[PDB]
Amino acid sequence: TLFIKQYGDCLGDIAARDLICAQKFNGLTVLPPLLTDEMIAQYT
Amino acid sequence: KCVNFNFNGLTGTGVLTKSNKKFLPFQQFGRDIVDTTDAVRDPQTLEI
Numbered sequence: 530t531l532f533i534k535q536y537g538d539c540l541g542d543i544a545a546r547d548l549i550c551a552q553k554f555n556g557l558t559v560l561p562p563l564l565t566d567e568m569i570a571q572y573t
Numbered sequence: 574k575c576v577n578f579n580f581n582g583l584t585g586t587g588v589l590t591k592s593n594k595k596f597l598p599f600q601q602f603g604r605d606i607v608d609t610t611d612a613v614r615d616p617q618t619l620e621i
């Protein structure tokens with residue numbers, strides 16, 4: 530159980546604020562991996 | 574709209590939206606899990 534997806538929008542804060550949103554609003558972002566899980570599964 | 578608010582002396586910068594959060598009558602301004610101001614109450618219209 531897991532970081533970015535498309536978190537640029539925080540859903541309008543309709544249900545509190547998750548830890549990811551609180552982290553994002555102060556300079557802490559997560560870059561997505563270069564190889565998606567589909568490509569990793571293709572390699573496997 | 575991204576604005577430089579000043580609510581009863583509390584300064585900041587951000588978009589203000591209507592909140593589904595229901596403040597209890599004694600409360601004034603909310604806080605996030607990481608202890609940052611998340612919601613405020615308008616000193617004039619008593620809106621959250």
Ligand SMILES: *[C@@H]1O[C@H](CO)[C@@H](O)[C@H](O)[C@H]1NC(C)=O
Pocket residue numbers: 616617618619
């Ligand atoms: C402040 O005054 C406005 C009118 O200027 C009024 O609508 C509002 O209810 C007042 N707020 C109070 C009494 O808390």
